[PDB]
Symmetry: D3
Subunit: 262 residues, 6 copies
Amino acid sequence: ADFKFEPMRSLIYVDCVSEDYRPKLQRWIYKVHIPDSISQFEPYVTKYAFYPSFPIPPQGDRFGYARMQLTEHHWLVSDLDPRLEIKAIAETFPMDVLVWQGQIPAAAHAEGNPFIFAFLPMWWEKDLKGKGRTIEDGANYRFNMTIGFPEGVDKAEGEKWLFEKVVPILQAAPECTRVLASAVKKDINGCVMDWVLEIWFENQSGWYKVMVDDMKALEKPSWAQQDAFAFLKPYHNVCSAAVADYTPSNNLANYRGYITMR
Amino acid sequence: ADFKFEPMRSLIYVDCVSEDYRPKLQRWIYKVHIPDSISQFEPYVTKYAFYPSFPIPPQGDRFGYARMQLTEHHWLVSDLDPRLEIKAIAETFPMDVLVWQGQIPAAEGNPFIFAFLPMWWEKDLKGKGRTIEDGANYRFNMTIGFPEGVDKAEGEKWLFEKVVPILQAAPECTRVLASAVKKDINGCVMDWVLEIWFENQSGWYKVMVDDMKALEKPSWAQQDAFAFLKPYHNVCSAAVADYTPSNNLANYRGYITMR
Amino acid sequence: ADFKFEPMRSLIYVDCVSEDYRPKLQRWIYKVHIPDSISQFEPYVTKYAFYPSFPIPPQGDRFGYARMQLTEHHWLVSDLDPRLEIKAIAETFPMDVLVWQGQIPAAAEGNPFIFAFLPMWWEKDLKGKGRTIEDGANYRFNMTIGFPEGVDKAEGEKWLFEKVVPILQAAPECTRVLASAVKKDINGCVMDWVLEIWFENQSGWYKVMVDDMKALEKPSWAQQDAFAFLKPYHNVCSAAVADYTPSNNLANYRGYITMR
Amino acid sequence: ADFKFEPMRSLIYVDCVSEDYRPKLQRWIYKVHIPDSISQFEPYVTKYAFYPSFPIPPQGDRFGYARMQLTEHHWLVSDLDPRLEIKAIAETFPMDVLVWQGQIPAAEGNPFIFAFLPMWWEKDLKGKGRTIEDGANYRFNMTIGFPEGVDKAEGEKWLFEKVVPILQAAPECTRVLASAVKKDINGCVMDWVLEIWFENQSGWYKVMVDDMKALEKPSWAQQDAFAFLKPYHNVCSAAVADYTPSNNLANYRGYITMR
Amino acid sequence: ADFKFEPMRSLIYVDCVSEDYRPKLQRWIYKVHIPDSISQFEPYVTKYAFYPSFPIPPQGDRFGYARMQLTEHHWLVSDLDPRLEIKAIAETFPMDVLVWQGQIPAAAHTDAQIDSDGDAGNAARKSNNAEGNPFIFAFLPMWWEKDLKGKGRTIEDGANYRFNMTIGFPEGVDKAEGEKWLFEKVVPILQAAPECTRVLASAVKKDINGCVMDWVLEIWFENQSGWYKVMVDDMKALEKPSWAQQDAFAFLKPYHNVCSAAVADYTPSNNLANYRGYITMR
Amino acid sequence: ADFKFEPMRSLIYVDCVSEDYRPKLQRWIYKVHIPDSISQFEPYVTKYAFYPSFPIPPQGDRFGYARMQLTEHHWLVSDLDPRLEIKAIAETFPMDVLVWQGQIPAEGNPFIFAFLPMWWEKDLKGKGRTIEDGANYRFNMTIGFPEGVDKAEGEKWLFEKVVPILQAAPECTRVLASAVKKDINGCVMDWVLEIWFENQSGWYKVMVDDMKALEKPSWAQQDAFAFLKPYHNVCSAAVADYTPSNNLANYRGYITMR
Ligand SMILES: [Cl-]
Ligand SMILES: [Cl-]
Ligand SMILES: [Cl-]
Ligand SMILES: [Cl-]
Ligand SMILES: [Cl-]
Ligand SMILES: [Cl-]
Ligand SMILES: [Cl-]
Ligand SMILES: [Cl-]
Ligand SMILES: [Cl-]
Ligand SMILES: [Cl-]
Ligand SMILES: [Cl-]
Ligand SMILES: [Cl-]
Ligand SMILES: [Cl-]
Ligand SMILES: [Cl-]
Ligand SMILES: [Cl-]
Ligand SMILES: [Cl-]
């Protein structure tokens, strides 16, 4: 049977719940996970990249801040087609990776956080501020944020709140240079998230001024899961990362094995 | 909504209207344009390449000869789908570039010719089976579009029944390939792209200038001799080699400068 | 007209019928064939690789063992679409290549050029699901079979999956069994199935594919007395290869650099 | 005259004194500095890499912790040979870079520390035979330079008879390597570079902070606790991973921007 | 015996004497010569690049303008050490290449491999046919010896029309006399011209391969007009030397005693990093 | 102290003593050894490559034929300088590798690691041959005269008795040779030669049949040429002109077949 052409970009929000885990998680990612992944999807993924996150900003924990990276894939076909479950060689994936990313608590003496894997079209659906901005305009502090409204909130009500109450605050702030948004493709993998936005600042201070201070003017919604914006449960209904314009980890082009420092 | 699988090869005819503009145009192309472009389309363009024009031959001006390069993309989706208009980072594009390329004049402008095609030539009209072992080719790539009010079928018939037979008869001409331009993509004015190979510039001249003198001048003619079309507006062209070092998705490593 | 999105993996079973041809065939492949091929299909083939064969095992000749390599392509469109026949530069492909590969005999008869198209993902996972590269090196025995003319395809299929595979499953020396139906509609390949069957090494391969298969009964359509009961190089081709190849050509080729 | 074969490894400790500067400094490093650097030294530098620092650990400020990266070069000739001062194209360098790194304060500064070493560690004092299969390392690279008028041999003795044994005794520390700085190349004030491995940040702290409390404070001390040297001036450091994707001569493909 | 560490940069001035030869010469260069060269010297050459020439400017012929490219190598050892004459695989080097480049006149049977008692490529690169133009292969230190104008210029200051020129004073002319003329008469004209943004120069290492050239300069302009204004118009002011081989600057015999090329800041042909075989257009 | 500039090419003759070891040895070579090696010497080795051996020819065992590969390094400094013994990260090298290569039984064969100058010292046949002249079957062979045998006398035998047989044979298209640098690492080998043929049959006709004309020297360790103890005093491999495993330029990690 045919395979459908389904160009998509996906984002995974990779946390690191303790600095003591960073070396181990980073090693698995760069030494094990890259070669396993490329081995599987080289023929139908056109780009595979990691964007390490900037240091977590003040109150970043309230936004489900991914303390390791964003992982980005560009797919030509849906990875969740059941026919794609079969692979010659399966990923080497230690259970400890779930500990390091916070999906399960360590057995030593934290509630677990879900694996958030959001599929999107390759092109942003909404361009809400900063159209025409070029790389010549300067370095961006790019705050990539995904949200999913809690169970029993009408999705249209959530959409309307996002674009009529939240985005306008972003748009008004001179500190914010770009707002982009796309609806999550929920039909692919059942992701609980509903929207991905990217919101650019000059720097962390700008991010804080708008995303913490300006957002205080918002009414607390009846569905709120925390007292302040985003009013959503960290790492379950909101995840995020702030990243640079460029990454050296463009894996299909740049990987040459796990060469170690001398 | 879905995106349609739409594999295409596109050609842009990049001119440089004065030699004094050459260093500047070339810098923008290789230092600024390449990375902006790869940044946008890496996930859905499988090949992005520049083929620098050979030196403009005698009377090449009459063929809308592109004095910088051919720019070639291979697309998996239509770049003109309205959804593709939104981009995080827009290309750095000074108005000067349009001057250097001649889109805005010294004197009327020359249009930006961006012709979409299928990935595979639709007509193999001469030299089927030529291999790279048969020798270096002087590859003359030419696009033409019939003027306002000329019936496209009459234009087509002229091309394939009058023009091509002359190329077929010349032993200087080793290859003739053609495709109809995909007009549905971007409203390109051009109607056909052809590639016509010779051994060298003299061969090109013998066939495209002298042998073509035998053609009768069409009633729609916009200049006195073949291609009888308005240079840079209804005909563009470049002669290029078989190989380019500028296969950009594979070969680019940043703008490293000479020591 | 439209071009259909048709993602596929293809395998070509490349023999070298005499050791004296190896340097010539190998030169053509790596010096001439690679750049011609990349030139043609770079924009719509996402992977192009060669997997050199391990040394032919005992009785490998009975399995149509390809003594040069497997050639693997991953396609986005069908290469057999007639619109794809046209190309600016044709491949430099002297008939000597078909002599070296055994398509044209020395002067028994020629062996067919076996070019099998498949889905990109294996259709059946029959043993060893979950195996990772960490579980160790594999002797990967890739085999394609085509039932003889006049054998009902469903009958052949039933034989393969009801009789042959259970023997593979029974053998601890066999760590993986994968299979896909050949896409016959693309290019008319005579083969019906491609399987890949992993062992630890040649001795394991032999114990199962030769000794354990003696328990099979000889089918009425047999073209040889022992499994695979099919005509070597005509109705069965194979190769044993490693997990990794350096010849991942769209990523790794830098021209024909010669040893000093 | 001849050029001397002088294979060396150098390290630069690159700080970022405020998070608000990170995006600008990183952009300059990766968009501008890389191609300028490669342009100049490609023919005589065999490796050029950046190792981004792990998040500054607690009390890391007292160790002159570089909050951006280590920059590492492998040289075939001395970059301080006066004949190498001449360059067709000079590096693009906004003054602001010195602010971002803390060399000059925002309108006292910290010096630019650029230490040359042999390509191979001179002393292997703990963990000989450790391979990459034994696990991920928290690699703490530290350079120290004894203050004005402290006898170098007395400093050395202190380092190797008092400091290193604490490292050798700590199970949390898996590796100790050291080389003397080549002071004759560029006047670097540093005297030693050590690299000291741990499993993680907490191990680092246990050893470099807690265990070192047993040391007697030297009479030359510039701060109360180990390393007893002035942060950023007489001691700099960074903790880095075993691997970097920024192996610049092999891996750089231009400043491709996120979509 | 030891091999001496001898880091050097070399330049070859590659002409193409007729446009009809261009496709053939360019094919040999990119299809045949690249892989042969990399195969031989990958272990001791750290950079190997081609910088295609800008279109020959007006009066460029009087400057020995290389109408194909500059070929540039960076060496760690001298390619002229006699021990380096031995090579497992020799360059495929038809005589046609010397025809296309102007080293020898057109003749029958020049598709033949070049002849030599030693190596064909090493002999091809010492070509000095009385009837053609010699093969100019100049060794230099890796770093310019003199920085005469434009110190501190960055790539941010703009695109350069880089005119690279080599000169060799005729037989009989005192080298010190020539040097003084160059640096006290010629260079000051370049220095005085606002159109000229950079002047760099090095002495040719003559001890390596007996190259006839004595100096390599690189002189930058904004463009072809600026080059012309300075190298043709401003240079009319110079008095003609008694040793002159032509009436106007550089007063040297084109292609024999002066060669040159104008090139861009960047080339895509950085061959050790960027070559992926001779992929042909579709 | 200074490091000396010492450009060299080295060869290692890598055997595989049983086909059942091949998948494991090859995995180790390509998955573990490559990155460990590059991690150590990237800054001072300009080339690192493997040339997989052609299938062992008849009587190849008498030439210490390497059934896995030749490993080639080009060094800028001597790897045997004791200062280079120190490495931050050591290589992962289990004793199994020595079993697979035949250095130890499960006395075995020595590890043969020969340093040469980067350029062949002697060009004895086929000077001028280009790659356009055709594919070569390149027989690379290193020999070391037994204990007690005078080196000059061995040398004379090689260049005056053996080589002229190669020169006379039209099947042999190239003869190159260099003296092994014995000062670097104590290698017992004295010469490396490379001898080209069109193919295996040509190799055999010359190296087996034509060499029967040679008198058995008094120091002979086997009855026929090369008269040296296989794997101990003669090793070899036959290889192609090209290898895809040019490791510093071509390696992208251990990507596995799907
Ligand atoms: Cl923590
Ligand atoms: Cl709260
Ligand atoms: Cl002009
Ligand atoms: Cl503008
Ligand atoms: Cl007219
Ligand atoms: Cl060939
Ligand atoms: Cl039988
Ligand atoms: Cl801060
Ligand atoms: Cl400034
Ligand atoms: Cl203090
Ligand atoms: Cl001409
Ligand atoms: Cl400019
Ligand atoms: Cl003279
Ligand atoms: Cl004159
Ligand atoms: Cl002796
Ligand atoms: Cl015997």
